[PDB]
Every structure is written in C-alpha cells, then in structure tokens.
Amino acid sequence: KLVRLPGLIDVHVHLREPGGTHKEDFASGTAAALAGGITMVCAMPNTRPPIIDGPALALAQKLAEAGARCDFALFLGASSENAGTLGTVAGSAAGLKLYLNETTSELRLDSVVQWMEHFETWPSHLPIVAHAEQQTVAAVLMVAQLTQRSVHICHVARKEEILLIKAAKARGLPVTCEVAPHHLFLSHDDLERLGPGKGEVRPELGSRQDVEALWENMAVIDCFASDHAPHTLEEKCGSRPPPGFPGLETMLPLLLTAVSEGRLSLDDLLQRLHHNPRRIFHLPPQEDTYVEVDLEHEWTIPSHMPFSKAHWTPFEGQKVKGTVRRVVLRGEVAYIDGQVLVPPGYGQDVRKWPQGAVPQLP
C-alpha cells in the first residue's frame, strides 16, 4: 500500500541556469525534484549572471518558464548596490536572499550596514532568507530586531546555531529556520569516505554532536530544504573544489527512512516539507497535486542518482527505506518509477498565480 503525500516544497535549490548549465539546468534540476517527491522549488540567485537586478530576474523567469518541469519561485539576491532598487520586482520573487558569509564578489556584502539597508528597503511583508553561519546567525538576528521584522535562517548545521535560534524563539522573536539533509545524515565521520573535495560544503559537515543536537532540537526546525548545490564530479574532485552537494533526489528517501525508524513522525516531515514552507514564504497550494511513496522498499543509494547533472552523491552507500513511486502535478502524471513524464516548460512561476502573491496592506 502506498501513502499519499501532498506536493512537497523545497525552499532552497540551486538550479544553475543561467550560466552553469553543465552542472544542472531548470529541466534537469526539476526532473530531480520530481523524482524526489518535490513539486515546487525556490531557486537561489547565485547564477551567472546573478539574479540581483530586474533584467536578470526577467531572463531567469523566462528560462525557468521554458525549462522547469515542476512549479517554482525565484529568489532575488542582495548585493552591495541594489538596496532600494528592487521594489518594483520584489513581489514577483520568492524572497530576498542574503549571502552573509564567504561568497562571490557580486553577492558579497562588506558591512553589516549593508544588511541593515536591505532590511530597511526590501518590502517588509516579503521574505528574507540568509546564509548565516555561527555568529552570523546572531548578527543577522540583531539586524532583524533593529529593523523590526522577521528573518529565515538557511541550512542550520550546528548545535551552536540551533541553540541560538531556540533561545531567540523562547524570547518570542520572529525567526524561522531550515535544515538540510546532509546536516542530519552526514558528519565528520563521513569525511574519510568522501574525501576533501567531495566533502566540501557550506555550511561544512558537523560533528556527531552537531548532528545529534539538530535531531534533539527538531521542534526548533521549521523546514527541511535540500540546498541542492550541484557541481560535476570533475569540479568536486579537482584543484579548487566548489562547495555543495546535490540533494533533491535523496532528501525524501533519507527522511522517510528516519520516519520508518521512529526518529520523527510523518506529520513532522509534512510540516517541514509542506505546511511550513507554504506559510513562511506564502506559497500557494497546487491543485490536483500529490506524491505517492512506498514506505517498505529498501534500497542502497548508488554512486549517482538518475536526474541531476551533478552525476555524483555524498550519500552513496547509505541504506534507505522508502521511495517515490508516482507524482501528479496539477492533474498530470509527472513521474512514475524512474521516468519523468512532463516536459520542460510544464512548470509555472507560482508568484504569477493570483493565490501566489504575498498579501500586503494597500
């Protein structure tokens, strides 16, 4: 007997188009999403060109409309030049992304004052998410309080970070967060197997104590999100390995394994991959959309999953229980047992749906 799940949402993916399409493109990345039981993705802005201005957003929107197989929203990225310039297009984006740690010259912010300027100028009803590690979590929380608004913390990876967020929630502060599967299912213990190139990711893999703290503090985690960050094996294994792991095709099987072991409940999973993504980002329902999973099927993750152009995975060799059998997206069969059955361009920008605009005061 299969279990019917709603259409799951991944609020943190890197689909590499424009400009990095040997790593992934909208068509391959959304195939990966569908095969992972994900029917809606929010794509990050660190493409080439980066999505830091209205022309780049317009290009990315058209590339996504033409290539995506599942539905999507596109983030804008904060830069050192664009605060106060995004007001006309802000509501068309998933939200604003701040890269507050090591990043590219185009997305780099050199001063906390620039963070403040973004918090002050970005429309106050629209989402802001941050790559903010270690003390940066506390720093961006301070900026959010100074500017009297919410913030969402991407890929929480450390005991330190989850406990800081827990303390902030205990004080009633408007902060939410997400955790990626590699920070729940991999640790320093895996670095020997992965090697130093494949093992490169930001935030880095944590200690066993970090992993245990995330599980212990599941109540603090609002969302799961993959941080799908595909790079080719040649890049990961070469002289200057870029950080990141592909993860769309493995996230749900890993989490279903944990459900089957009683580490979290089915409801806990659906809050974190469906209801909380919807409510934090004001993402609309998808009509006639669902995912059928087989919870009994035991398998071992292979050296690469079928769809991502990354063509490698750090979870190779892990034994999992649970698999996606069928996905229906807006009344059409999108995926069955290893075959994607909707073409590039079937997917739509959810921010253009009437129900997909973020409500605001006039």
Ligand X SMILES: O=C1C[C@@H](C(=O)O)NC(=O)N1
Residues found near Zn ion in the complex (CB under 5 A): 12, 129, 131, 154, 227
Rounded distance, CA 196 to CA 177, Å? Answer: 28
Which of the choices ligand X, Zn ion, none does residue 201 contact, using the CB cut-off of 5 to 8 A by kind? ligand X
By beta-carbon proximity to ligand X, the closer residue of 46 and 348 is 46
State the CB neighbour count (10 A cutoff) for residue 219.
9
263: phi then psi, degrees, rounded to nearest 5: -80, -25
Binding residue per annotation — 183?
no
Binding residue per annotation — 292?
no
Which of the choices Zn ion, ligand X, none does residue 242 contact, using the CB cut-off of 5 to 8 A by kind? ligand X
39: phi then psi, degrees, rounded to nearest 5: -110, -5
Binding residue per annotation — 154?
yes
Q: Which residue is nearest to Zn ion (CB)?
A: 154
Residues that bind ligand X (CB under 6 A): 14, 46, 131, 201-202, 229, 242-244
Rounded to the nearest 10°, the torsion over CA 101, 102, 108, 109 is 40
Which of the choices ligand X, Zn ion, none does residue 154 contact, using the CB cut-off of 5 to 8 A by kind? Zn ion
Give least dist CB 196 to ligand X, A. 14
By beta-carbon proximity to ligand X, the closer residue of 33 and 293 is 33
Catalytic residue among 71, 210, 227, 349: 227
Q: What angle do CA 93, 114, 144 make, to 5 degrees?
A: 70
Binding residue per annotation — 198?
no
By beta-carbon proximity to Zn ion, the closer residue of 155 and 320 is 155
71 is known as an active-site residue: no
Which of the choices ligand X, Zn ion, none does residue 30 contact, using the CB cut-off of 5 to 8 A by kind? none
Give least dist CB 300 to Zn ion, A. 27
Binding residue per annotation — 203?
no
Rounded distance, CA 198 to CA 231, Å? Answer: 10
Q: Which residues are annotated as a binding site for Zn(2+)?
A: 12, 14, 97, 131, 154-155, 178, 227
- Catalytic annotation, residues: 227
